Design a protein around this motif. Sequence first.
Motif, PDB file in Angstrom:
ATOM      1  N   UNK B  20     -15.466 -19.415  37.339  1.00  0.00           N
ATOM      2  CA  UNK B  20     -14.001 -19.548  37.257  1.00  0.00           C
ATOM      3  C   UNK B  20     -13.500 -20.214  36.038  1.00  0.00           C
ATOM      4  N   UNK B  21     -14.375 -21.618  36.102  1.00  0.00           N
ATOM      5  CA  UNK B  21     -14.277 -22.234  34.626  1.00  0.00           C
ATOM      6  C   UNK B  21     -14.434 -21.521  33.439  1.00  0.00           C
ATOM      7  N   UNK B  22     -15.675 -20.651  33.452  1.00  0.00           N
ATOM      8  CA  UNK B  22     -16.242 -20.166  32.140  1.00  0.00           C
ATOM      9  C   UNK B  22     -15.126 -18.865  31.943  1.00  0.00           C
ATOM     10  N   UNK B  23     -14.656 -18.459  33.019  1.00  0.00           N
ATOM     11  CA  UNK B  23     -13.689 -17.220  32.647  1.00  0.00           C
ATOM     12  C   UNK B  23     -12.306 -17.772  32.015  1.00  0.00           C
ATOM     13  N   UNK B  24     -11.762 -19.109  32.569  1.00  0.00           N
ATOM     14  CA  UNK B  24     -10.606 -19.552  32.128  1.00  0.00           C
ATOM     15  C   UNK B  24     -10.871 -20.093  30.691  1.00  0.00           C
ATOM     16  N   UNK B  25     -12.076 -20.478  30.101  1.00  0.00           N
ATOM     17  CA  UNK B  25     -12.737 -20.922  28.938  1.00  0.00           C
ATOM     18  C   UNK B  25     -12.538 -19.798  27.877  1.00  0.00           C
ATOM     19  N   UNK B  26     -13.171 -18.874  28.392  1.00  0.00           N
ATOM     20  CA  UNK B  26     -13.129 -17.465  27.661  1.00  0.00           C
ATOM     21  C   UNK B  26     -11.627 -16.935  27.230  1.00  0.00           C
ATOM     22  N   UNK B  27     -10.603 -17.125  28.437  1.00  0.00           N
ATOM     23  CA  UNK B  27      -9.274 -16.844  28.168  1.00  0.00           C
ATOM     24  C   UNK B  27      -8.704 -17.604  27.123  1.00  0.00           C
ATOM     25  N   UNK B  28      -9.044 -18.730  26.907  1.00  0.00           N
ATOM     26  CA  UNK B  28      -8.522 -19.703  25.818  1.00  0.00           C
ATOM     27  C   UNK B  28      -9.300 -19.649  24.406  1.00  0.00           C
ATOM     28  N   UNK B  29     -10.444 -18.803  24.617  1.00  0.00           N
ATOM     29  CA  UNK B  29     -11.242 -18.798  23.595  1.00  0.00           C
ATOM     30  C   UNK B  29     -12.670 -19.249  23.871  1.00  0.00           C
TER      31      UNK B  29
END
Lengths: 29, 29, 29
Positions: B20-29
């Motif tokens: 969930x942390x890596x998906x959120x990072x991917x969301x913001x780039x």
Amino acid sequence: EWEALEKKLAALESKLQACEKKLEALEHG
Amino acid sequence: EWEALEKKLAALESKLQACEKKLEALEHG
Amino acid sequence: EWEALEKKLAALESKLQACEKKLEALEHG
Ligand SMILES: [Zn+2]
Ligand SMILES: [Zn+2]
Ligand SMILES: [Zn+2]
Ligand SMILES: [Zn+2]
Ligand SMILES: [Zn+2]
Ligand SMILES: [Zn+2]
């Protein structure tokens, strides 16, 4: 404890489905 | 089996948290 | 019920492994 484990497992299932859905809609758009 | 399963639930929970942390990072780039 | 809880944990972990593999493919092309 048995029932706390069972509720954690339900939330994990719901969280994982929420991931699965973010994951999808990042894949798209 | 009990503390083994608890350990296994704890590992999934943190793997999911990572996800969930890596998906959120991917969301913001 | 124990065996049902374990099967649910196995299934969660399969879906997580699958969400993790999809996330790597999205991060890295
Ligand atoms: Zn406990
Ligand atoms: Zn314990
Ligand atoms: Zn966000
Ligand atoms: Zn954010
Ligand atoms: Zn990654
Ligand atoms: Zn990369």
